């Protein structure tokens, strides 16, 4: 009849592990099974231990991070992000944490399984056969 919340929210992590190259743009897929309890989204690499803030929906000037989909819209479950200019020092495992709207600030509610990033060292030049046109 009149039901808005379907079950209990849950961090959906389709991409078990991403694959990119030093200097490429990674795609950390993420989506919740619901919007309740309401709350923003925050990424952290190494959840539980050594967790480093990757992105912050609430605020934060992150140029490298380009929201794959508009979050301003209404009822936007898709919370996937794209970190451009990937580095071999940022690799590891990004855990999509679903923070719940709270005061004075949000509060950790769910923790994504943890998407492992596979940063592939920069590429290399092709087999350089001397300097000159084909001979013999």
N, CA, C and O atoms as CSV, one atom per row, in Angstrom:
chain,resi,resn,atom,element,x,y,z
A,1,UNK,N,N,0.807,-1.206,0.000
A,1,UNK,CA,C,0.000,0.000,0.000
A,1,UNK,C,C,0.843,1.261,0.000
A,1,UNK,O,O,1.165,1.800,-1.059
A,2,UNK,N,N,1.201,1.732,1.190
A,2,UNK,CA,C,2.007,2.939,1.323
A,2,UNK,C,C,3.319,2.640,2.041
A,2,UNK,O,O,3.455,2.893,3.238
A,3,UNK,N,N,4.282,2.100,1.300
A,3,UNK,CA,C,5.583,1.762,1.865
A,3,UNK,C,C,6.709,2.401,1.058
A,3,UNK,O,O,6.754,2.278,-0.166
A,4,UNK,N,N,7.614,3.083,1.753
A,4,UNK,CA,C,8.727,3.732,1.086
A,4,UNK,C,C,10.032,2.982,1.272
A,4,UNK,O,O,10.803,2.820,0.327
A,5,UNK,N,N,10.279,2.523,2.494
A,5,UNK,CA,C,11.503,1.791,2.803
A,5,UNK,C,C,11.310,0.295,2.580
A,5,UNK,O,O,10.467,-0.334,3.220
A,6,UNK,N,N,12.098,-0.268,1.668
A,6,UNK,CA,C,12.013,-1.689,1.357
A,6,UNK,C,C,13.134,-2.464,2.044
A,6,UNK,O,O,14.238,-2.582,1.511
A,7,UNK,N,N,12.840,-2.990,3.230
A,7,UNK,CA,C,13.832,-3.747,3.972
A,7,UNK,C,C,14.839,-2.854,4.672
A,7,UNK,O,O,14.487,-1.789,5.179
A,8,UNK,N,N,16.094,-3.289,4.699
A,8,UNK,CA,C,17.153,-2.522,5.344
A,8,UNK,C,C,18.256,-2.174,4.349
A,8,UNK,O,O,18.652,-3.005,3.532
A,9,UNK,N,N,18.746,-0.942,4.426
A,9,UNK,CA,C,19.804,-0.482,3.532
A,9,UNK,C,C,20.988,-1.443,3.551
A,9,UNK,O,O,21.185,-2.180,4.517
A,10,UNK,N,N,21.773,-1.428,2.478
A,10,UNK,CA,C,22.939,-2.296,2.373
A,10,UNK,C,C,23.863,-1.834,1.251
A,10,UNK,O,O,23.411,-1.542,0.144
A,11,UNK,N,N,25.158,-1.769,1.546
A,11,UNK,CA,C,26.146,-1.343,0.562
A,11,UNK,C,C,26.376,-2.423,-0.489
A,11,UNK,O,O,26.893,-3.497,-0.185
A,12,UNK,N,N,25.986,-2.128,-1.725
A,12,UNK,CA,C,26.152,-3.073,-2.823
A,12,UNK,C,C,27.455,-2.823,-3.574
A,12,UNK,O,O,27.644,-1.762,-4.170
A,13,UNK,N,N,28.350,-3.805,-3.540
A,13,UNK,CA,C,29.635,-3.690,-4.218
A,13,UNK,C,C,29.762,-4.733,-5.324
A,13,UNK,O,O,30.207,-5.855,-5.082
A,14,UNK,N,N,29.364,-4.351,-6.546
A,14,UNK,CA,C,29.423,-5.238,-7.711
A,14,UNK,C,C,30.856,-5.514,-8.157
A,14,UNK,O,O,31.217,-6.655,-8.442
A,15,UNK,N,N,31.666,-4.462,-8.215
A,15,UNK,CA,C,33.059,-4.593,-8.626
A,15,UNK,C,C,33.926,-5.074,-7.466
A,15,UNK,O,O,34.316,-4.288,-6.603
A,16,UNK,N,N,34.223,-6.369,-7.455
A,16,UNK,CA,C,35.044,-6.957,-6.403
A,16,UNK,C,C,36.431,-6.323,-6.377
A,16,UNK,O,O,37.047,-6.200,-5.318
A,17,UNK,N,N,36.916,-5.922,-7.548
A,17,UNK,CA,C,38.232,-5.302,-7.659
A,17,UNK,C,C,38.367,-4.548,-8.978
A,17,UNK,O,O,38.074,-5.087,-10.044
A,18,UNK,N,N,38.814,-3.299,-8.894
A,18,UNK,CA,C,38.990,-2.468,-10.081
A,18,UNK,C,C,40.386,-2.642,-10.669
A,18,UNK,O,O,41.305,-3.095,-9.987
A,19,UNK,N,N,40.536,-2.278,-11.939
A,19,UNK,CA,C,41.819,-2.395,-12.622
A,19,UNK,C,C,42.101,-1.155,-13.464
A,19,UNK,O,O,41.331,-0.814,-14.362
A,20,UNK,N,N,43.211,-0.485,-13.166
A,20,UNK,CA,C,43.597,0.717,-13.895
A,20,UNK,C,C,45.113,0.816,-14.026
A,20,UNK,O,O,45.840,-0.090,-13.621
A,21,UNK,N,N,45.581,1.924,-14.594
A,21,UNK,CA,C,47.010,2.143,-14.776
A,21,UNK,C,C,47.438,3.485,-14.191
A,21,UNK,O,O,46.716,4.476,-14.297
A,22,UNK,N,N,48.615,3.508,-13.575
A,22,UNK,CA,C,49.139,4.729,-12.975
A,22,UNK,C,C,48.890,5.934,-13.876
A,22,UNK,O,O,49.591,6.134,-14.868
A,23,UNK,N,N,47.887,6.734,-13.522
A,23,UNK,CA,C,47.564,7.909,-14.309
A,23,UNK,C,C,46.208,7.800,-14.980
A,23,UNK,O,O,45.811,8.684,-15.739
A,24,UNK,N,N,45.495,6.714,-14.700
A,24,UNK,CA,C,44.177,6.494,-15.283
A,24,UNK,C,C,43.076,6.818,-14.279
A,24,UNK,O,O,43.352,7.151,-13.127
A,25,UNK,N,N,41.827,6.717,-14.726
A,25,UNK,CA,C,40.684,7.002,-13.868
A,25,UNK,C,C,39.991,5.713,-13.438
A,25,UNK,O,O,39.494,4.957,-14.274
A,26,UNK,N,N,39.964,5.469,-12.133
A,26,UNK,CA,C,39.331,4.272,-11.591
A,26,UNK,C,C,37.839,4.495,-11.364
A,26,UNK,O,O,37.389,5.630,-11.211
A,27,UNK,N,N,37.079,3.404,-11.344
A,27,UNK,CA,C,35.639,3.480,-11.139
A,27,UNK,C,C,35.202,2.593,-9.979
A,27,UNK,O,O,35.095,1.375,-10.124
A,28,UNK,N,N,34.951,3.210,-8.830
A,28,UNK,CA,C,34.524,2.475,-7.645
A,28,UNK,C,C,33.002,2.394,-7.573
A,28,UNK,O,O,32.358,3.225,-6.933
A,29,UNK,N,N,32.437,1.389,-8.232
A,29,UNK,CA,C,30.991,1.199,-8.242
A,29,UNK,C,C,30.451,1.064,-6.821
A,29,UNK,O,O,31.075,0.432,-5.968
A,30,UNK,N,N,29.289,1.660,-6.576
A,30,UNK,CA,C,28.665,1.609,-5.261
A,30,UNK,C,C,27.197,2.020,-5.338
A,30,UNK,O,O,26.846,2.974,-6.032
A,31,UNK,N,N,26.346,1.293,-4.621
A,31,UNK,CA,C,24.918,1.583,-4.607
A,31,UNK,C,C,24.241,0.951,-3.395
A,31,UNK,O,O,24.563,-0.173,-3.010
A,32,UNK,N,N,23.305,1.681,-2.799
A,32,UNK,CA,C,22.583,1.192,-1.629
A,32,UNK,C,C,21.240,0.592,-2.032
A,32,UNK,O,O,20.652,0.985,-3.039
A,33,UNK,N,N,20.761,-0.362,-1.239
A,33,UNK,CA,C,19.489,-1.017,-1.514
A,33,UNK,C,C,18.316,-0.147,-1.073
A,33,UNK,O,O,17.156,-0.503,-1.280
A,34,UNK,N,N,18.627,0.994,-0.466
A,34,UNK,CA,C,17.599,1.913,0.006
A,34,UNK,C,C,18.203,3.269,0.360
A,34,UNK,O,O,19.419,3.450,0.305
A,35,UNK,N,N,17.345,4.215,0.722
A,35,UNK,CA,C,17.792,5.555,1.086
A,35,UNK,C,C,17.589,5.812,2.576
A,35,UNK,O,O,17.939,6.877,3.084
A,36,UNK,N,N,17.023,4.829,3.268
A,36,UNK,CA,C,16.777,4.948,4.700
A,36,UNK,C,C,17.573,3.909,5.482
A,36,UNK,O,O,17.642,2.744,5.092
A,37,UNK,N,N,18.179,4.345,6.597
A,37,UNK,CA,C,18.094,5.735,7.052
A,37,UNK,C,C,18.862,6.690,6.144
A,37,UNK,O,O,19.920,6.344,5.619
A,38,UNK,N,N,18.322,7.892,5.965
A,38,UNK,CA,C,18.958,8.897,5.121
A,38,UNK,C,C,20.382,9.182,5.584
A,38,UNK,O,O,20.702,9.035,6.764
A,39,UNK,N,N,21.233,9.589,4.647
A,39,UNK,CA,C,22.614,9.888,4.978
A,39,UNK,C,C,23.490,10.017,3.749
A,39,UNK,O,O,23.220,9.401,2.718
A,40,UNK,N,N,24.554,10.827,3.858
A,40,UNK,CA,C,25.493,11.054,2.755
A,40,UNK,C,C,26.338,9.822,2.451
A,40,UNK,O,O,26.011,8.714,2.875
A,41,UNK,N,N,27.425,10.023,1.714
A,41,UNK,CA,C,28.319,8.929,1.356
A,41,UNK,C,C,29.779,9.335,1.520
A,41,UNK,O,O,30.175,10.432,1.128
A,42,UNK,N,N,30.574,8.441,2.103
A,42,UNK,CA,C,31.992,8.705,2.316
A,42,UNK,C,C,32.826,7.463,2.024
A,42,UNK,O,O,32.520,6.372,2.506
A,43,UNK,N,N,33.878,7.636,1.233
A,43,UNK,CA,C,34.757,6.527,0.876
A,43,UNK,C,C,35.999,6.511,1.759
A,43,UNK,O,O,36.499,7.562,2.160
A,44,UNK,N,N,36.492,5.313,2.058
A,44,UNK,CA,C,37.677,5.161,2.895
A,44,UNK,C,C,38.459,3.909,2.508
A,44,UNK,O,O,37.905,2.811,2.461
A,45,UNK,N,N,39.747,4.085,2.232
A,45,UNK,CA,C,40.605,2.971,1.847
A,45,UNK,C,C,41.300,2.374,3.067
A,45,UNK,O,O,42.141,3.021,3.692
A,46,UNK,N,N,40.943,1.138,3.400
A,46,UNK,CA,C,41.541,0.475,4.544
A,46,UNK,C,C,40.638,0.489,5.761
A,46,UNK,O,O,41.113,0.474,6.896
A,47,UNK,N,N,39.329,0.517,5.524
A,47,UNK,CA,C,38.357,0.533,6.609
A,47,UNK,C,C,38.765,-0.421,7.726
A,47,UNK,O,O,39.265,-1.516,7.466
A,48,UNK,N,N,38.549,0.001,8.968
A,48,UNK,CA,C,38.903,-0.829,10.105
A,48,UNK,C,C,40.311,-0.568,10.599
A,48,UNK,O,O,40.579,-0.639,11.799
A,49,UNK,N,N,41.215,-0.264,9.673
A,49,UNK,CA,C,42.604,0.009,10.021
A,49,UNK,C,C,43.310,0.768,8.903
A,49,UNK,O,O,43.396,0.287,7.773
A,50,UNK,N,N,43.814,1.955,9.226
A,50,UNK,CA,C,44.506,2.762,8.238
A,50,UNK,C,C,43.566,3.334,7.196
A,50,UNK,O,O,43.991,3.694,6.098
A,51,UNK,N,N,42.285,3.419,7.540
A,51,UNK,CA,C,41.282,3.950,6.625
A,51,UNK,C,C,41.572,5.410,6.287
A,51,UNK,O,O,41.589,6.269,7.169
A,52,UNK,N,N,41.798,5.681,5.006
A,52,UNK,CA,C,42.088,7.037,4.554
A,52,UNK,C,C,40.920,7.605,3.753
A,52,UNK,O,O,40.432,6.974,2.816
A,53,UNK,N,N,40.477,8.800,4.131
A,53,UNK,CA,C,39.366,9.455,3.449
A,53,UNK,C,C,39.636,9.569,1.952
A,53,UNK,O,O,40.638,10.152,1.536
A,54,UNK,N,N,38.737,9.009,1.149
A,54,UNK,CA,C,38.877,9.052,-0.301
A,54,UNK,C,C,38.003,10.145,-0.906
A,54,UNK,O,O,38.435,10.875,-1.798
A,55,UNK,N,N,36.774,10.251,-0.414
A,55,UNK,CA,C,35.837,11.255,-0.907
A,55,UNK,C,C,34.821,11.626,0.168
A,55,UNK,O,O,34.572,10.853,1.093
A,56,UNK,N,N,34.238,12.814,0.038
A,56,UNK,CA,C,33.249,13.288,0.998
A,56,UNK,C,C,32.092,13.985,0.288
A,56,UNK,O,O,32.266,15.054,-0.297
A,57,UNK,N,N,30.915,13.372,0.344
A,57,UNK,CA,C,29.730,13.934,-0.295
A,57,UNK,C,C,29.360,15.275,0.329
A,57,UNK,O,O,29.194,16.271,-0.375
A,58,UNK,N,N,29.234,15.292,1.651
A,58,UNK,CA,C,28.884,16.511,2.371
A,58,UNK,C,C,29.653,17.708,1.821
A,58,UNK,O,O,29.056,18.681,1.361
A,59,UNK,N,N,30.979,17.627,1.872
A,59,UNK,CA,C,31.828,18.705,1.378
A,59,UNK,C,C,33.200,18.174,0.973
A,59,UNK,O,O,33.449,16.969,1.022
A,60,UNK,N,N,34.086,19.082,0.574
A,60,UNK,CA,C,35.422,18.687,0.166
A,60,UNK,C,C,35.688,18.973,-1.298
A,60,UNK,O,O,34.941,18.531,-2.171
A,61,UNK,N,N,36.758,19.715,-1.569
A,61,UNK,CA,C,37.122,20.061,-2.938
A,61,UNK,C,C,38.006,18.981,-3.555
A,61,UNK,O,O,39.230,19.024,-3.432
A,62,UNK,N,N,37.378,18.016,-4.217
A,62,UNK,CA,C,38.107,16.924,-4.851
A,62,UNK,C,C,37.949,16.974,-6.368
A,62,UNK,O,O,36.953,16.498,-6.913
A,63,UNK,N,N,38.948,17.557,-7.048
A,63,UNK,CA,C,38.945,17.683,-8.508
A,63,UNK,C,C,39.124,16.339,-9.205
A,63,UNK,O,O,38.465,16.057,-10.206
A,64,UNK,N,N,40.020,15.515,-8.671
A,64,UNK,CA,C,40.287,14.201,-9.243
A,64,UNK,C,C,39.034,13.330,-9.212
A,64,UNK,O,O,38.807,12.522,-10.112
A,65,UNK,N,N,38.227,13.501,-8.170
A,65,UNK,CA,C,36.997,12.731,-8.020
A,65,UNK,C,C,35.864,13.344,-8.835
A,65,UNK,O,O,35.448,14.475,-8.583
A,66,UNK,N,N,35.368,12.589,-9.811
A,66,UNK,CA,C,34.283,13.058,-10.663
A,66,UNK,C,C,33.049,12.173,-10.518
A,66,UNK,O,O,33.023,11.044,-11.009
A,67,UNK,N,N,32.030,12.693,-9.840
A,67,UNK,CA,C,30.794,11.950,-9.630
A,67,UNK,C,C,30.271,11.372,-10.940
A,67,UNK,O,O,29.870,12.111,-11.839
A,68,UNK,N,N,30.277,10.046,-11.040
A,68,UNK,CA,C,29.801,9.368,-12.241
A,68,UNK,C,C,28.366,9.769,-12.564
A,68,UNK,O,O,28.002,9.915,-13.731
A,69,UNK,N,N,27.557,9.945,-11.524
A,69,UNK,CA,C,26.160,10.324,-11.698
A,69,UNK,C,C,25.783,11.458,-10.748
A,69,UNK,O,O,26.318,11.559,-9.644
A,70,UNK,N,N,24.860,12.308,-11.189
A,70,UNK,CA,C,24.412,13.434,-10.378
A,70,UNK,C,C,23.795,12.953,-9.069
A,70,UNK,O,O,22.887,12.122,-9.069
A,71,UNK,N,N,24.295,13.480,-7.956
A,71,UNK,CA,C,23.794,13.104,-6.639
A,71,UNK,C,C,22.751,14.103,-6.148
A,71,UNK,O,O,22.028,13.837,-5.188
A,72,UNK,N,N,22.680,15.252,-6.813
A,72,UNK,CA,C,21.725,16.289,-6.445
A,72,UNK,C,C,20.293,15.834,-6.699
A,72,UNK,O,O,19.381,16.180,-5.949
A,73,UNK,N,N,20.104,15.057,-7.760
A,73,UNK,CA,C,18.782,14.552,-8.112
A,73,UNK,C,C,18.095,13.931,-6.901
A,73,UNK,O,O,18.699,13.794,-5.837
A,74,UNK,N,N,16.831,13.559,-7.069
A,74,UNK,CA,C,16.062,12.953,-5.988
A,74,UNK,C,C,16.007,11.436,-6.145
A,74,UNK,O,O,15.746,10.924,-7.233
A,75,UNK,N,N,16.255,10.725,-5.050
A,75,UNK,CA,C,16.235,9.266,-5.065
A,75,UNK,C,C,17.357,8.716,-5.940
A,75,UNK,O,O,17.115,7.921,-6.848
A,76,UNK,N,N,18.583,9.146,-5.660
A,76,UNK,CA,C,19.744,8.696,-6.421
A,76,UNK,C,C,20.549,7.670,-5.630
A,76,UNK,O,O,21.376,8.029,-4.793
A,77,UNK,N,N,20.300,6.393,-5.902
A,77,UNK,CA,C,21.001,5.314,-5.217
A,77,UNK,C,C,22.440,5.199,-5.711
A,77,UNK,O,O,23.364,5.003,-4.921
A,78,UNK,N,N,22.622,5.323,-7.022
A,78,UNK,CA,C,23.948,5.237,-7.622
A,78,UNK,C,C,24.916,6.198,-6.940
A,78,UNK,O,O,24.806,7.415,-7.089
A,79,UNK,N,N,25.864,5.643,-6.192
A,79,UNK,CA,C,26.851,6.451,-5.484
A,79,UNK,C,C,28.265,6.098,-5.934
A,79,UNK,O,O,29.198,6.093,-5.131
A,80,UNK,N,N,28.415,5.806,-7.223
A,80,UNK,CA,C,29.713,5.448,-7.780
A,80,UNK,C,C,30.559,6.693,-8.031
A,80,UNK,O,O,30.045,7.729,-8.453
A,81,UNK,N,N,31.857,6.582,-7.767
A,81,UNK,CA,C,32.773,7.699,-7.965
A,81,UNK,C,C,33.930,7.304,-8.879
A,81,UNK,O,O,34.224,6.120,-9.047
A,82,UNK,N,N,34.581,8.304,-9.464
A,82,UNK,CA,C,35.704,8.062,-10.363
A,82,UNK,C,C,36.889,8.952,-10.001
A,82,UNK,O,O,36.825,10.173,-10.142
A,83,UNK,N,N,37.968,8.330,-9.535
A,83,UNK,CA,C,39.168,9.064,-9.155
A,83,UNK,C,C,40.163,9.127,-10.308
A,83,UNK,O,O,40.859,8.152,-10.591
A,84,UNK,N,N,40.223,10.279,-10.970
A,84,UNK,CA,C,41.132,10.468,-12.094
A,84,UNK,C,C,42.562,10.680,-11.606
A,84,UNK,O,O,42.785,11.137,-10.485
A,85,UNK,N,N,43.526,10.344,-12.458
A,85,UNK,CA,C,44.935,10.497,-12.116
A,85,UNK,C,C,45.339,9.511,-11.023
A,85,UNK,O,O,45.966,9.890,-10.034
A,86,UNK,N,N,44.976,8.247,-11.210
A,86,UNK,CA,C,45.302,7.208,-10.242
A,86,UNK,C,C,46.810,7.084,-10.056
A,86,UNK,O,O,47.583,7.352,-10.976
A,87,UNK,N,N,47.222,6.676,-8.859
A,87,UNK,CA,C,48.637,6.516,-8.551
A,87,UNK,C,C,48.905,5.174,-7.879
A,87,UNK,O,O,48.027,4.611,-7.226
A,88,UNK,N,N,50.134,4.665,-8.046
A,88,UNK,CA,C,50.546,3.384,-7.462
A,88,UNK,C,C,50.674,3.454,-5.944
A,88,UNK,O,O,51.053,2.476,-5.299
A,89,UNK,N,N,50.356,4.615,-5.380
A,89,UNK,CA,C,50.434,4.810,-3.938
A,89,UNK,C,C,49.042,4.930,-3.325
A,89,UNK,O,O,48.895,4.984,-2.104
A,90,UNK,N,N,48.026,4.971,-4.180
A,90,UNK,CA,C,46.647,5.084,-3.722
A,90,UNK,C,C,45.948,3.728,-3.759
A,90,UNK,O,O,44.874,3.557,-3.183
A,91,UNK,N,N,46.568,2.769,-4.439
A,91,UNK,CA,C,46.007,1.428,-4.551
A,91,UNK,C,C,45.691,0.848,-3.176
A,91,UNK,O,O,46.071,1.416,-2.152
A,92,UNK,N,N,44.996,-0.284,-3.162
A,92,UNK,CA,C,44.641,-0.921,-1.908
A,92,UNK,C,C,43.242,-1.505,-1.928
A,92,UNK,O,O,42.982,-2.487,-2.624
A,93,UNK,N,N,42.338,-0.899,-1.163
A,93,UNK,CA,C,40.960,-1.367,-1.095
A,93,UNK,C,C,40.030,-0.265,-0.600
A,93,UNK,O,O,40.102,0.146,0.558
A,94,UNK,N,N,39.158,0.209,-1.484
A,94,UNK,CA,C,38.214,1.265,-1.137
A,94,UNK,C,C,36.909,0.677,-0.610
A,94,UNK,O,O,36.239,-0.091,-1.300
A,95,UNK,N,N,36.556,1.046,0.617
A,95,UNK,CA,C,35.332,0.555,1.239
A,95,UNK,C,C,34.254,1.634,1.244
A,95,UNK,O,O,34.394,2.662,1.906
A,96,UNK,N,N,33.179,1.390,0.502
A,96,UNK,CA,C,32.074,2.337,0.420
A,96,UNK,C,C,31.286,2.369,1.725
A,96,UNK,O,O,30.471,1.485,1.989
A,97,UNK,N,N,31.534,3.392,2.536
A,97,UNK,CA,C,30.847,3.539,3.813
A,97,UNK,C,C,29.616,4.429,3.675
A,97,UNK,O,O,29.707,5.557,3.190
A,98,UNK,N,N,28.469,3.915,4.105
A,98,UNK,CA,C,27.220,4.662,4.033
A,98,UNK,C,C,26.932,5.371,5.352
A,98,UNK,O,O,26.374,4.779,6.276
A,99,UNK,N,N,27.316,6.641,5.433
A,99,UNK,CA,C,27.099,7.430,6.640
A,99,UNK,C,C,25.636,7.848,6.760
A,99,UNK,O,O,25.006,8.224,5.772
A,100,UNK,N,N,25.104,7.778,7.976
A,100,UNK,CA,C,23.716,8.148,8.226
A,100,UNK,C,C,23.618,9.587,8.724
A,100,UNK,O,O,24.403,10.014,9.570
A,101,UNK,N,N,22.651,10.327,8.192
A,101,UNK,CA,C,22.448,11.717,8.582
A,101,UNK,C,C,22.323,11.845,10.097
A,101,UNK,O,O,21.340,11.396,10.687
A,102,UNK,N,N,23.324,12.459,10.720
A,102,UNK,CA,C,23.306,12.636,12.160
A,102,UNK,C,C,23.942,13.942,12.592
A,102,UNK,O,O,24.563,14.635,11.786
A,103,UNK,N,N,23.788,14.280,13.868
A,103,UNK,CA,C,24.348,15.514,14.405
A,103,UNK,C,C,25.277,15.224,15.580
A,103,UNK,O,O,25.106,14.231,16.288
A,104,UNK,N,N,26.267,16.105,15.783
A,104,UNK,CA,C,26.464,17.283,14.934
A,104,UNK,C,C,26.943,16.917,13.534
A,104,UNK,O,O,27.108,17.786,12.678
A,105,UNK,N,N,27.164,15.627,13.307
A,105,UNK,CA,C,27.622,15.145,12.010
A,105,UNK,C,C,27.103,13.737,11.739
A,105,UNK,O,O,26.551,13.088,12.627
A,106,UNK,N,N,27.284,13.273,10.507
A,106,UNK,CA,C,26.833,11.942,10.118
A,106,UNK,C,C,27.503,10.870,10.972
A,106,UNK,O,O,28.447,11.152,11.710
A,107,UNK,N,N,27.007,9.641,10.867
A,107,UNK,CA,C,27.557,8.526,11.630
A,107,UNK,C,C,27.616,7.258,10.786
A,107,UNK,O,O,26.646,6.902,10.116
A,108,UNK,N,N,28.759,6.581,10.823
A,108,UNK,CA,C,28.944,5.352,10.062
A,108,UNK,C,C,27.808,4.370,10.330
A,108,UNK,O,O,27.522,4.037,11.481
A,109,UNK,N,N,27.165,3.910,9.262
A,109,UNK,CA,C,26.058,2.966,9.382
A,109,UNK,C,C,26.411,1.629,8.737
A,109,UNK,O,O,26.254,0.573,9.350
A,110,UNK,N,N,26.889,1.685,7.498
A,110,UNK,CA,C,27.266,0.480,6.768
A,110,UNK,C,C,28.677,0.607,6.200
A,110,UNK,O,O,29.194,1.713,6.040
A,111,UNK,N,N,29.292,-0.531,5.898
A,111,UNK,CA,C,30.644,-0.547,5.350
A,111,UNK,C,C,30.744,-1.523,4.181
A,111,UNK,O,O,30.667,-2.738,4.366
A,112,UNK,N,N,30.917,-0.980,2.979
A,112,UNK,CA,C,31.025,-1.816,1.798
A,112,UNK,C,C,32.040,-2.929,1.965
A,112,UNK,O,O,32.994,-2.798,2.732
A,113,UNK,N,N,31.835,-4.028,1.246
A,113,UNK,CA,C,32.740,-5.168,1.319
A,113,UNK,C,C,34.192,-4.727,1.177
A,113,UNK,O,O,35.070,-5.214,1.889
A,114,UNK,N,N,34.438,-3.802,0.254
A,114,UNK,CA,C,35.786,-3.312,0.036
A,114,UNK,C,C,36.305,-3.641,-1.349
A,114,UNK,O,O,36.736,-4.765,-1.607
A,115,UNK,N,N,36.266,-2.658,-2.244
A,115,UNK,CA,C,36.734,-2.849,-3.611
A,115,UNK,C,C,38.245,-2.680,-3.704
A,115,UNK,O,O,38.781,-1.621,-3.378
A,116,UNK,N,N,38.927,-3.730,-4.151
A,116,UNK,CA,C,40.379,-3.696,-4.286
A,116,UNK,C,C,40.788,-3.057,-5.611
A,116,UNK,O,O,40.279,-3.424,-6.670
A,117,UNK,N,N,41.708,-2.102,-5.541
A,117,UNK,CA,C,42.185,-1.411,-6.734
A,117,UNK,C,C,43.504,-2.008,-7.218
A,117,UNK,O,O,44.414,-2.250,-6.425
A,118,UNK,N,N,43.597,-2.241,-8.523
A,118,UNK,CA,C,44.804,-2.811,-9.112
A,118,UNK,C,C,45.522,-1.782,-9.980
A,118,UNK,O,O,45.357,-1.761,-11.199
A,119,UNK,N,N,46.319,-0.932,-9.341
A,119,UNK,CA,C,47.064,0.100,-10.052
A,119,UNK,C,C,48.205,-0.506,-10.861
A,119,UNK,O,O,49.166,-1.031,-10.299
A,120,UNK,N,N,48.092,-0.430,-12.184
A,120,UNK,CA,C,49.114,-0.972,-13.070
A,120,UNK,C,C,50.164,0.085,-13.399
A,120,UNK,O,O,49.858,1.109,-14.010
A,121,UNK,N,N,51.402,-0.172,-12.989
A,121,UNK,CA,C,52.498,0.757,-13.240
A,121,UNK,C,C,52.397,1.359,-14.637
A,121,UNK,O,O,51.879,0.728,-15.558
A,122,UNK,N,N,52.895,2.582,-14.786
A,122,UNK,CA,C,52.862,3.270,-16.072
A,122,UNK,C,C,53.354,2.357,-17.190
A,122,UNK,O,O,54.155,1.452,-16.957
A,123,UNK,N,N,52.864,2.604,-18.414
A,123,UNK,CA,C,53.241,1.816,-19.592
A,123,UNK,C,C,54.686,2.060,-20.014
A,123,UNK,O,O,55.410,2.819,-19.369
A,124,UNK,N,N,55.098,1.412,-21.099
A,124,UNK,CA,C,56.459,1.556,-21.605
A,124,UNK,C,C,56.456,1.780,-23.114
A,124,UNK,O,O,55.454,1.534,-23.785
A,125,UNK,N,N,57.584,2.248,-23.639
A,125,UNK,CA,C,57.713,2.503,-25.068
A,125,UNK,C,C,57.923,1.205,-25.841
A,125,UNK,O,O,58.448,0.231,-25.303
A,126,UNK,N,N,57.505,1.201,-27.116
A,126,UNK,CA,C,57.637,0.030,-27.987
A,126,UNK,C,C,59.088,-0.257,-28.358
A,126,UNK,O,O,59.969,0.577,-28.145
A,127,UNK,N,N,59.329,-1.441,-28.913
A,127,UNK,CA,C,60.673,-1.836,-29.315
A,127,UNK,C,C,61.251,-0.862,-30.336
A,127,UNK,O,O,60.881,-0.886,-31.510
A,128,UNK,N,N,62.161,-0.007,-29.880
A,128,UNK,CA,C,62.792,0.975,-30.753
A,128,UNK,C,C,63.943,0.355,-31.537
A,128,UNK,O,O,64.989,0.036,-30.973
A,129,UNK,N,N,63.741,0.187,-32.840
A,129,UNK,CA,C,64.761,-0.399,-33.702
A,129,UNK,C,C,65.611,0.688,-34.354
A,129,UNK,O,O,65.322,1.133,-35.465
A,130,UNK,N,N,66.659,1.110,-33.653
A,130,UNK,CA,C,67.537,2.140,-34.177
A,130,UNK,C,C,66.772,3.337,-34.709
A,130,UNK,O,O,65.545,3.384,-34.626
A,131,UNK,N,N,67.498,4.306,-35.256
A,131,UNK,CA,C,66.882,5.510,-35.798
A,131,UNK,C,C,67.015,5.553,-37.318
A,131,UNK,O,O,68.040,5.981,-37.849
A,132,UNK,N,N,65.971,5.106,-38.010
A,132,UNK,CA,C,65.990,5.101,-39.461
A,132,UNK,C,C,64.923,4.201,-40.051
A,132,UNK,O,O,64.320,3.394,-39.344
A,133,UNK,N,N,64.687,4.341,-41.364
A,133,UNK,CA,C,63.684,3.543,-42.078
A,133,UNK,C,C,64.093,2.079,-42.207
A,133,UNK,O,O,65.239,1.720,-41.935
A,134,UNK,N,N,63.150,1.240,-42.622
A,134,UNK,CA,C,63.411,-0.185,-42.784
A,134,UNK,C,C,64.580,-0.418,-43.737
A,134,UNK,O,O,64.657,0.196,-44.801
A,135,UNK,N,N,65.485,-1.309,-43.347
A,135,UNK,CA,C,66.651,-1.622,-44.165
A,135,UNK,C,C,66.954,-3.117,-44.130
A,135,UNK,O,O,66.745,-3.779,-43.113
A,136,UNK,N,N,67.449,-3.641,-45.248
A,136,UNK,CA,C,67.772,-5.053,-45.326
A,136,UNK,C,C,66.648,-5.934,-44.819
A,136,UNK,O,O,66.775,-7.159,-44.822
